[PDB]
Symmetry: C3
Subunit: 277 residues, 3 copies
């Protein structure tokens, strides 16, 4: 259960599609757009060619954090990488391994928890597209990274989680002992503090300490702002057991207004003690 070495050339089709109630989402197949968009996963060294199509009546773009791209796949109107209504375009993302440069220094690799979003809808910074749902996660794995049993994306988009109505989660289910990966992206105007009851993670790339010499803070509450992204893997219920473990923004008015969800951790027999919605 470990990521291999990257270096594969990959292609994928992506669509921008209008969704109900003024929303917009990215999808891998027509009519399957979602908010957040599909989880794109690569190994360091992989190339991704996204054959992009804009099914909408307004221009859209695709912009990505962290990964290597040339200025033609900027996803910006300034560098003419947006997609007119009905248009098509191939965005190219590349990734690289860490390595020692010629100058002696250490080149950082592409691995990490990243994301993509629109850059042209509403404003030339994608303010309207991000608000409508044009955002999604990208995970770039380093060779040897432990692979999880499940991955869940939580996006604090302004006062919402994944553009959902207040006090509607989302909820995620796991069994005690599962290796669960959380991808956490923030968008919009507000800062947040992400908090998980009964679980904690390392404030580093993978969310797990590398070993006894990793000085990274171990936290259960992280401040984050627009376009921040981080991730972590936890063992569900580790040292704490089954239950309906709350997660929420800890800004007090934000959790009061419904930026809350449940990490529903079950015993092997499928039971969650005390849970009563």
């Amino acid at each position: 259960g470990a990521a291999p070495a990257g270096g594969e050339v990959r292609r994928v089709t992506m669509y921008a599609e209008r969704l109900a109630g003024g929303q917009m989402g990215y999808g891998l197949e027509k009519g399957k757009a979602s908010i957040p968009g599909p989880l794109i996963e690569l190994n360091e060294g992989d190339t991704l060619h996204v054959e992009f199509e804009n099914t909408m009546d307004v221009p859209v773009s695709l912009h990505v954090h962290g990964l290597d791209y040339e200025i033609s796949s900027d996803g910006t109107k300034q560098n003419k990488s947006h997609v007119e209504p009905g248009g098509t375009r191939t965005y190219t993302w590349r990734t690289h391994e860490p390595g020692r440069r010629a100058d002696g220094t250490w080149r950082a690799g592409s691995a990490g928890y990243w994301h993509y979003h629109d850059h042209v809808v509403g404003t030339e910074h994608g303010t309207g597209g991000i608000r409508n749902g044009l955002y999604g996660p990208v995970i770039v794995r380093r060779k040897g990274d432990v692979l999880p049993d499940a991955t869940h994306t939580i996006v604090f988009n302004d006062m919402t989680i994944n553009n959902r109505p207040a006090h509607t989660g989302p909820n995620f289910e796991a069994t005690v002992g599962d290796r669960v990966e959380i991808v956490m992206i923030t968008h919009g105007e507000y800062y947040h503090t992400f908090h998980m009851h009964g679980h904690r993670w390392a404030d580093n790339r993978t969310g797990m300490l590398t070993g006894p010499d990793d000085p990274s803070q171990v936290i259960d509450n992280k401040i984050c702002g627009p376009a921040d992204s981080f991730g972590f893997q936890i063992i569900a219920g580790e040292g704490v057991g089954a239950g309906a473990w709350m997660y929420h923004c800890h800004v007090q008015s934000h959790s009061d207004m419904g930026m809350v969800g449940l990490f529903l951790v079950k015993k092997p027999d499928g039971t969650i003690p005390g849970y009563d919605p």
Copy 2:
């Protein structure tokens, strides 16, 4: 001194009580609540049973960050771990040491600068209870950790420090060369940036670089938001001498509105150079 190995079963009585000025606070003995609440110190591996009593006319709870607890000690109304008016309940916190798992991976230990607070007063997230002063620090030490000469707790609670009126500190005294530990917790609605004149610390677990290979950034200014907690140790006046050293939130309107205090570092003879209280 250094922190020893944990693994002891500890017991403590805690009370939630109404305090003067429409506030609420935790204490270890009845009639002795405080804001911030009492400092709790544990060694990785210790277990803590908190014999809790609610002396108030409203439900209250005890919820902790960082430490291990089963869901029955979650301290939320959502699964019946709150304490009714006049009720009692034992909460149990555990802690563990770091080590390796069967799957080859490293499990981080409980050590850190943590905190406890209410979760049911006002809202199902404790907004009223936190605002009223139901919060306190929890320190979990790892074996070998350097012990301080003194520990001081600074909570940025909305626009107050430790719920105090504007421009009323608190101030903390030390002697030059003392090893002083600061526990910094934030609560409420607003982000802040904690800044200390004349001192700096590492942005890691303990606030001190482990040694020459520790890449952690060394800072004197840290942004923090609701329920953030961190801590550090500094040598009072190290390389800067005695004096009235300001700490404050560096958000400009927050300092201008009184989120300011003094770290009063004394010379051995007790005096503080240039410290005219009236000019502060």
Copy 3:
């Protein structure tokens, strides 16, 4: 090219606080050449800097620094009587130190890092007006052996402006593909921000560069910052992405919409920027 040498040199410099146009105020190293941000101060761990300070303004001003070692008498605060009356002069003394093992066996952190100085008395006793007006500037303290850049650029998010510039007027910064560029990022004022750069990423540690394969620091292209935060990093301009007009901006959506945007203009070796229309 080069690495930082060991420190330990006692340096002196004159500094002036001057009014600038548009009600602004700035620090400078020579009379009549004040700037916003103020001049870049660079030191090697162990150096001392005596700032021979002159307030040429009609209101009091001060000089307060982050991170470096200073005695209470160089606090730069009215509260500790180290401000400078109109027309007055004062010598501020900053010191730095290398890291080392203390007698008690613990490790003393060095002064090295990305720091800043600013006023502490104009407008309020916390310098709110001075900072608003532009009295801020960067300080870099290098550790022996630190990689030296080809150029250094200072970006300050001061309330809703970058370096007190009007909305949407940069600043822009030019480099050639392959250049080692150092960014100093400071934030001031009332608001939090998130600094983001297209096409480039860095390490969230002291230097912005991973020390090697065992450095666990996170690699980021987006960082939340708040008033008086400072961090810095070095990047290889266009590394793995090529030339072009690469945006940097605050990623708070209404902040980029209302002018907190700039361009990192990475040129080809022939000096051209593909697809860049000014």
